[PDB]
């Protein structure tokens, strides 16, 4: 529930947390909140995770069809416009707040998309429940035309702040960098949180539990 994106001197850097939770308890620590769309387009989704996943899959399929028909690389602008029109057709009932980053023929682009269908092109965008911490980190340590490492560190710090100041994000950070030339998608970018081992290991063997019936049906 903490995703962010930024444009640096070369292209786009996208980042996301991994604490996918339903209700109030953590359901997963390895959510894939940075969806692939095109070899030059990625999008980070927040909110109803199923809706975000279906939206990203549909956009990826539509841009696959478009690019393969036109013989050109997919555009961030066409993806953004399709997202806007579809979400607006559903009047925001698709609980998906998206950060669409990518590099196209006209240059790197970053867009903030709201579930009601509103979109905006901004150099740095944060979204999710923990969006405010990452937004503050960006407003504090953002510069125009930053280097690759500076952008990566800034996004990492923003995700770390969102993780440590929100109760719906953590346990990993995901990064994806898109440029004019190279696309990198490093999922376990940095694991700022570890787990201590169980001090007293407690294990059981057969005969510790009570079983009523056994049924073996060997397969081949």
């Amino acid at each position: 529930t903490t995703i962010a994106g930024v444009v640096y001197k070369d292209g786009i850097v996208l980042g996301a947390d991994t604490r996918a939770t339903e209700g109030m308890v953590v359901a997963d620590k390895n959510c894939s909140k940075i969806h692939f769309i095109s070899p030059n387009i990625y999008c980070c989704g927040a909110g109803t995770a199923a809706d975000t996943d279906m939206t990203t899959q549909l956009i990826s399929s539509n841009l696959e069809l478009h690019s393969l028909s036109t013989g050109r690389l997919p555009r961030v602008v066409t993806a953004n416009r399709m997202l806007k029109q579809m979400l607006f057709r559903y009047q925001g009932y698709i609980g998906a707040a998206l950060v669409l980053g990518g590099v196209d023929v006209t240059g790197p682009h970053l867009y903030s998309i709201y579930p009601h269908g509103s979109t905006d092109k901004l150099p740095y965008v944060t979204m999710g429940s923990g969006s405010l911490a990452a937004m503050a980190v960006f407003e504090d340590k953002f510069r125009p035309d930053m280097e690759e490492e500076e952008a990566k560190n800034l996004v990492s710090e923003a995700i770390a702040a969102g993780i440590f100041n929100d109760l719906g994000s953590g346990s990993n950070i995901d990064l994806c960098v898109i440029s004019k030339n190279k696309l990198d998608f490093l999922r376990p970018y940095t694991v700022p949180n570890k787990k201590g081992t169980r001090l007293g290991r407690y294990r059981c063997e057969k005969g510790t539990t009570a079983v009523l019936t056994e049924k073996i049906t060997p397969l081949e």
């Binding site: 478009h66 602008v77 066409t78 416009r81 399709m82 023929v105």
Partner: protein
């Protein structure tokens, strides 16, 4: 003299014994029925469509019979065959281009527009309940990363990219002129391209046309919006080619 017909093979577009579609191939000569020849060429950085303007009578407003249509700002087109069919295809192309612009956020590439128009023409060819729009459209534009582009659809629908081609009664003669010109000269500038475009019509049809007897459209990489030449530019190019 015993004008027999083979049922409906020669009457509606169904598969003929010779593996042909008779009403599809009638459209090729339906292009000729218009009696007008349109030839288009592209330079290294420009694309020029030159078309003779027919004036069967002074009593009609010849300033309003211009057959060059701007599909978008940067896409111009000209058609051959039935003029009503030409207007319908121009309207459909404008609709599709605008729809692509809204649905995809940027101007439609000329190749994709030609592909969509060709698919619509194939919709007519496939169906056996509609006239297969016996009209041929040729369109121009300026494309990034690829340069000036000229595309041409057809009632059959088989389109292709090309340096230069023509549609009309004397499209074969214009094709021959294009063959001889491409085998003679290769390097083309803007003025050479426009001079060759005028020379194609002049050599093929041999009319010594007046300045008002043609309508010419150009797309250049200085203001990629499709612009139509007026009488001043027509006379300038005429005298330049003459000298």
């Amino acid at each position: 003299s015993r004008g027999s017909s083979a049922g409906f093979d020669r009457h509606i577009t169904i598969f003929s014994p010779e593996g042909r579609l008779y009403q599809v191939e009638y459209a090729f000569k339906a292009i000729n029925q218009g009696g007008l020849t349109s030839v288009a060429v592209r330079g290294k950085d420009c694309a020029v469509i030159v078309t003779q303007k027919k004036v069967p009578d002074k009593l009609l407003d010849s300033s309003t019979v211009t057959h060059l249509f701007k599909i978008t700002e940067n896409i111009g087109c000209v058609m051959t065959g039935m003029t009503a069919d030409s207007r319908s295809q121009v309207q459909r192309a404008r609709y599709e281009a605008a729809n692509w612009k809204y649905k995809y956020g940027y101007e439609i590439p000329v190749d994709m527009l030609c592909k969509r128009i060709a698919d619509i023409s194939q919709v007519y060819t496939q169906n056996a309940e509609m006239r297969p729009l016996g009209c041929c459209m040729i369109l121009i534009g300026i494309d990034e990363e690829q340069g000036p582009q000229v595309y041409k659809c057809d009632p059959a629908g088989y389109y292709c990219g090309f340096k230069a081609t023509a549609a009309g009664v004397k499209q074969t003669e214009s094709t021959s002129f294009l063959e001889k010109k491409v085998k003679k000269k290769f390097d083309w500038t803007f003025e050479q391209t426009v001079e060759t475009a005028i020379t194609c019509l002049s050599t093929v049809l041999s009319i010594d046309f007046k300045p008002s007897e043609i309508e010419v459209g150009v797309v250049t990489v200085e203001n990629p919006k499709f612009r139509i030449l007026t009488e001043a530019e027509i006379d300038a190019h005429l005298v330049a080619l003459a000298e």
